[PDB]
Write a protein that binds this ligand. Structure first.
Ligand code: HEM
Ligand SMILES: CNc1nc2ccccc2[nH]1
Length: 289
């Protein structure tokens, strides 16, 4: 299956910077969401879930088609809670209806990362909405109750290696779990993008416990938590080395995350040779806005 990036007609960098800015300004405005976390974390998660349906073997799923807008995918139990990010983006789409759904969802994640003081993530336009029958079945997003071998095998379907997996999981510094969404009991929450995930894994005192939904999770006396799949990154020796690398080098984490996240968001897409180069958007802070 071949999906060729097609630039929304007549649009260029400045058009997408205005979309970025509208997203970033709403992130600042609607600051009360989720006990003052704001929408940054759920938007990152949304961009990952719309991309993480991809299958390298046949190029089904992926961000290209914008299929999260369809009920089969919108109601995937793995996507419980992402409707909040969808609702956030609705007024942005109403204002800028020329943008494709896939480009909007993916740009939401890029904007959220950068506004939360994370790395710059180059981003490319040209995702094209595809029909309802191209929506992938539920069950392609990962389970949380598994070990390192599961995580490694899982991410091979997304063409991700050990370093890319460990770097992408650092997004779990952001936001929190919610029992009613996923059956995991949240710990301390944050809306600033840092390498704290790896520091916490290494430095905290963890105890395996069973939460009120009967699921196992690792809890620290300081009030943080880790899913079994998070904790697997210090149980496996190859993952552990990389966790230590990122805990000790903020800049290296930022660079590796940026590459892996752009790749995730672009998997499945064929970019023509005359396609525009990737866009690097300015933050509101950089613009004096
Ligand atoms: C093995 C891989 C992964 C598993 C099993 C996993 C599972 C989870 C679970 C169970 C939650 C809690 C959801 C809730 O209760 O609201 C969560 C939250 C989150 N995940 Fe992951 N995840 C994985 C990988 C990733 C990746 C690769 C990214 C991004 C690069 C990411 C970004 C997030 C964000 C930003 C949140 C917080 C959402 C919020 O605060 O609303 N996750 N994830
Ligand atoms: C500290 N915030 C946080 N920890 C998580 C673990 C798993 C999923 C999301 C998370 N957000």
């Amino acid at each position: 299956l071949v999906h060729v990036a097609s630039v929304e007609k007549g649009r260029s960098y400045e058009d997408f910077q205005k979309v970025y800015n509208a997203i970033a300004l709403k992130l600042r405005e609607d600051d009360e969401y989720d006990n003052y976390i704001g929408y940054g974390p759920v938007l990152v998660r949304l961009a990952w879930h719309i991309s993480g349906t991809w299958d390298k073997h046949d190029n089904t799923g992926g961000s290209y088609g914008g299929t999260y807008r369809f009920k089969k995918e919108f109601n995937d139990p793995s996507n419980a809670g992402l409707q909040n990010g969808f609702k956030f983006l609705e007024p942005i789409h109403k204002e800028f209806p020329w943008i494709s759904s896939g480009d909007l969802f993916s740009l939401g994640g890029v904007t959220a990362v950068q506004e939360m003081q994370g790395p710059k993530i180059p981003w490319r336009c040209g995702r094209v909405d595809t029909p309802e029958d191209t929506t992938p079945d539920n069950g392609r997003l990962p389970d949380a109750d598994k070990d390192a071998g599961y995580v490694r095998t899982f991410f091979q379907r997304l063409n991700m290696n050990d370093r890319e997996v460990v770097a992408l999981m650092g997004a779990h510094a952001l936001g929190k779990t919610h029992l009613k969404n996923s059956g995991y009991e949240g710990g301390g929450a944050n809306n600033v993008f840092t390498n704290e995930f790896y520091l916490n894994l290494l430095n905290e005192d963890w105890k395996l416990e069973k939460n009120d939904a009967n699921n196992e999770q690792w809890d620290s006396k300081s009030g943080y938590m880790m899913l079994p799949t998070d904790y697997s990154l210090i149980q496996d020796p190859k993952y552990l080395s990389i966790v230590k690398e990122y805990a000790n080098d903020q800049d290296k984490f930022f660079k590796d995350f940026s590459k892996a996240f752009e790749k995730l968001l672009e998997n499945g897409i064929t970019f023509p040779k005359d396609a525009p180069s990737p866009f690097i958007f300015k933050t509101l802070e950089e613009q004096g806005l």
